[PDB]
């Protein structure tokens, strides 16, 4: 490709790139056809591409798919890349447990991104700190990696290939879930991770048990929201609207304010 300039590897095979035509930073993602259990279309593509095209309309919250190419043994995806960027997993490794004000700003922007995906008929299925980029200058979070996603539907899902420690007990125990409620569980895991510095459950037994112990000082409202998202019963979990109207979610900072206060 002379239409992009390839740079160094970000980490799976995704590379820093630069769109030759206008120097737009980009990430160039290579997906081997071997590793695709999920195909779709409009001719034959990875489902990850179908889902990206559905979420890449307009702005934002989700890293957009700008173009893609097919190769003999692989597809190549050209995605947005903010600059500077750092993913939520490193940010958490570096900074430890986040102050609640920062965690609320972040968790909200995630809630918006996930609602965007849902509105577009897309279910992500692997929401977790590693799958979230922070644009360090705009305080904006951007969801990446639809590689485990599906079309949103209202019936039961009987396959999952996301991250186990973020999967809910109805998956662990029955190999079934519904989209929204499973998503809300992962969002509960993510929030605990933001406020505690780490994920609450390592092993199936602690997932099935869904008892949450706090290793850090976390306020009541925040702990109540987390336990709400991690209700054992999928129908006892809040909807996105209920989560965004929870007291702990009031008075969120703008992304810009978030960067100026918490990101330098
Ligand atoms: N999936 C995916 C990629 C993705 O969408 C992205 C964008 C910027 C920097 C890294 C990445 C990813 O790893």
Q: Please, what are the domains in the chain? A: 1-83 (3.30.200.20), 84-264 (1.10.510.10)
The angle subtended at Cα 23 by Cα 76 and Cα 67, nearest 5°, is: 25
Ligand 1 pocket check: which of 27, 61, 117 to mutate, most ligand atoms within 8 Å of Cβ? 27
Look at phi and psi of residue 35 and say left if phi exceeds 0, alpha if psi is from -120 to 50, else beta.
alpha
Cβ–Cβ under 8 Å, residues 128 and 189? yes
Phi, psi of 253 (to 5 degrees): -75, 145
The pair of structure tokens assigned to 87 is 């993913």
Q: What is the structure's resolution, reported in angstroms to one decimal?
A: 2.5
Query: What pairing do the DSSP bridges indicate for beta strands 85-87 and 65-70?
Result: unpaired
| Cα–Cα distance measured from residue 168 to residue 183, given in angstroms and rounded to the nearest whole number | 9
The pair of structure tokens assigned to 222 is 């925040």
The kind and range of the H/E element at 142 are strand 140-143
Phi, psi of 44 (to 5 degrees): -90, 120
Query: What pairing do the DSSP bridges indicate for beta strands 132-135 and 74-80?
Result: unpaired
What separation in Å is there between the alpha carbon of 200 and the centre of ligand 1?
A: 26
State the number of CA atoms in the 13 A half-sphere of 146 facing the CB.
30
Which listed residue (22, 38, 126, 198) is catalytic? 126
What separation in Å is there between the alpha carbon of 230 and the centre of ligand 1?
A: 28
- Please tell me the residue having the least CA distance from ligand 1 atom 1: 145
Nearest ligand 1 atom, CA 144: 5
Nearest Cα residue to 164 out of 196, 139, 186, 138: 186
The pair of structure tokens assigned to 202 is 């390592």
- Give yes or no for residue 27 CB within 6 A of ligand 1: yes
Nearest Cα residue to 141 out of 197, 191, 82, 182: 82
Report how far apart, in Å, the C-alpha atoms of 106 and of each of 181, 204, 223 are: 20, 27, 16
Phi, psi of 128 (to 5 degrees): -175, 170
Asked about 73 being catalytic, the answer comes back as: no
Q: How was this structure determined?
A: X-ray
- Give yes or no for residue 66 CB within 6 A of ligand 1: no
Residues 6+ apart with CB under 8 A from 21: 3
| Cα–Cα distance measured from residue 70 to residue 77, given in angstroms and rounded to the nearest whole number | 9
| Cα–Cα distance measured from residue 95 to residue 40, given in angstroms and rounded to the nearest whole number | 40
| Cα–Cα distance measured from residue 52 to residue 264, given in angstroms and rounded to the nearest whole number | 31
The overall longest dimension of the chain from CA atoms, in Å, is 55
State the number of CA atoms in the 13 A half-sphere of 17 facing the CB.
23
């Amino acid at each position: 490709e002379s239409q992009y300039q390839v740079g160094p590897l970000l980490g799976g095979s995704v590379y820093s790139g630069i769109r030759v035509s206008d120097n737009l930073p980009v990430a160039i993602k290579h997906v081997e056809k071997d590793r695709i259990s999920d195909w779709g279309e409009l001719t034959r593509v990875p489902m990850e591409v179908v889902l990206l095209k559905k979420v890449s309309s307009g702005f934002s919250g989700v890293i957009r798919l700008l173009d893609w190419f097919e190769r003999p043994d692989s597809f190549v995806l050209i995605l947005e890349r903010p600059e500077p960027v750092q993913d939520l997993f490193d940010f958490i490794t570096e900074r430890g447990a986040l102050q609640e004000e920062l965690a609320r700003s972040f968790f909200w922007q995630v809630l918006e991104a996930v609602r965007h995906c849902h509105n577009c008929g897309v279910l992500h299925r692997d929401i977790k700190d590693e799958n979230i980029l922070i644009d360090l200058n705009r305080g904006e979070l951007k969801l990446i990696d639809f590689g485990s996603g599906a079309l949103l539907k209202d019936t039961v899902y009987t396959d999952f290939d996301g991250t186990r420690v973020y999967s809910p007990p109805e998956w662990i125990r029955y190999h079934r879930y519904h989209g929204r409620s499973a998503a809300v569980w992962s969002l509960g895991i993510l929030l605990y991770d933001m406020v505690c510095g780490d994920i609450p459950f390592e092993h199936d037994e602690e997932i099935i048990r869904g008892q949450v112990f706090f290793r850090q000082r976390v306020s009541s409202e925040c702990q109540h929201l987390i336990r709400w998202c991690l209700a054992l019963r999928p129908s006892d979990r809040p909807t996105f609207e209920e989560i965004q109207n929870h007291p702990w979610m009031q008075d969120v900072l703008l992304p810009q304010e978030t960067a100026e206060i918490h990101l330098h």
